[PDB]
């Protein structure tokens, strides 16, 4: 190839990188209008390590809330944790859409002590609801986060149905073997808008 | 080379970029569990420029605290400043580790007025403590931040000792010639965990 070709390859490459890395709109991004429901969706793993205080006196232990799973920031610790290997999380998307794919990501191995990431979700499934609250929602896909793959992993539904949704569940069924908890860094939802 | 080779080079390149740029775990990253001690570690350069206020009435002048040196955000101003060319800073790492290398970084010249960065630290040294508070700690290395090098600079200890640590000092001995202060953007600590 010629130098000219290389620059174009790089430009294109850098451009895709700056489009939230994967280049697909995220109907689950919080700032874009997505929100977590809380009342529906798992209890946060309680730790009591991080004590924040001002002007001298202790205030409270902060612990990451479920909403960080919809927040772009994914440095180590920027995850939401829950007790054990199985867990609920439920999003109201910023718009009603036909869900075509989802994206899950974890912190890179290379940035993790001992280059292991045992608190990464393993098998998961996506349910879509079309009214909010409970009745139990349509299964849309049952995937597996590869701990030996890249950190951002996109999963395209094998032949999804045409029905549209605004509420969805992320259900983590197992993790990669951490004894105490499971950290979830960022969860993305893509689809064709109801327009 | 072939186009195929180029894409692989770029992919690999972009991948390393997204691993906190240098691809090594940072035992001094705050969100990962590192914290600053404060009582031990220098007084912040007082300025009285930035006046934040709500609903109409003045509240206080905010000034960057020492903890920003452990925070990933490194746009101009995202630094911690101190009086003159010499200064203390002390971290409790997120884990006890054998410190192998450190990383210091400053804002790029190209992003700085007159493309000079005179408030950048010059010579520094790293002390490691194994009990916290004072007795005076083991020197681990005496380095120099190159103002004409790249912005992120990694310094590998010349034959470090096998002793492990969880507390460490960053001691700035001189800077690159600013008269009033020294800004420190992000300070990183790498090593093999005590496992």
């Amino acid at each position: 190839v010629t130098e000219e070709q290389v620059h174009h390859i790089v430009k294109q490459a850098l451009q895709r990188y700056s489009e939230d890395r994967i280049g697909l709109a995220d109907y689950a991004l919080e700032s874009g209008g997505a929100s977590v429901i809380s009342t529906r969706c798992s209890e946060t793993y309680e730790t009591k390590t991080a004590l924040l205080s001002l002007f001298g006196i202790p205030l409270w232990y902060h612990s990451q809330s479920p909403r960080v799973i919809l927040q772009p920031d994914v440095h180590p610790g920027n995850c939401w944790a829950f007790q054990g290997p199985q867990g609920f999380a439920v999003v109201r998307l910023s718009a009603r859409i036909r869900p075509t794919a989802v994206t899950l990501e974890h912190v890179p191995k290379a940035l993790s002590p001992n280059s292991t990431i045992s608190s990464a979700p393993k098998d998961f499934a996506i349910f879509g609801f079309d009214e909010d609250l409970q009745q139990e929602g349509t299964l849309l896909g049952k995937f597996t986060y590869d701990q030996d793959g890249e950190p951002i992993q996109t999963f395209h539904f094998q032949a999804p149905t045409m029905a549209t949704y605004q509420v969805v569940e992320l259900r983590i069924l197992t993790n990669w073997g951490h004894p105490e908890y499971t950290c979830i860094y960022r969860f993305r939802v893509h689809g064709e808008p109801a327009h | 080379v072939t186009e195929e080779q180029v894409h692989h080079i770029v992919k690999q390149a972009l991948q390393r970029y997204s691993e906190d740029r240098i691809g090594l775990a940072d035992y001094a990253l705050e969100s990962g569990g590192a914290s600053v001690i404060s009582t031990r570690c220098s007084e912040t350069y007082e300025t009285k420029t930035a006046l934040l206020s709500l609903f109409g009435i003045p509240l206080w002048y905010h000034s960057q605290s020492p903890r920003v040196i452990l925070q990933p955000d490194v746009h101009p101003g995202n630094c911690w400043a101190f009086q003159g060319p010499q200064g203390f800073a002390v971290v409790r790492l997120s884990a006890r580790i054998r410190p192998t290398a450190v990383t210091l970084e400053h804002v790029p010249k190209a992003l700085s007025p007159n493309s000079t960065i005179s408030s950048a630290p010059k010579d520094f040294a790293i002390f490691g403590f194994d009990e916290d508070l004072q007795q005076e700690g083991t020197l681990l290395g005496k380095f120099t931040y190159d103002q004409d090098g790249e912005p992120i600079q990694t310094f590998h200890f010349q034959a470090p000792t096998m002793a492990t640590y969880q507390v460490v000092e960053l001691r700035i001995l001189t800077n690159w010639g600013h008269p009033e202060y020294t800004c420190i953007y992000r300070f990183r600590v790498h090593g093999e965990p005590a496992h």
């Binding site: 793993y45 991080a50 180590p76 610790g77 944790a81 | 569990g33 914290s35 605290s65 409790r92």
Partner: peptide, 14 residues
């Protein structure tokens, strides 16, 4: 605001 942060126990979840 200027709140100091300290990890009394271990690391946070990762």
């Amino acid at each position: 605001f200027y709140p100091m942060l300290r990890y009394t126990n271990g690391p946070p979840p990762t």
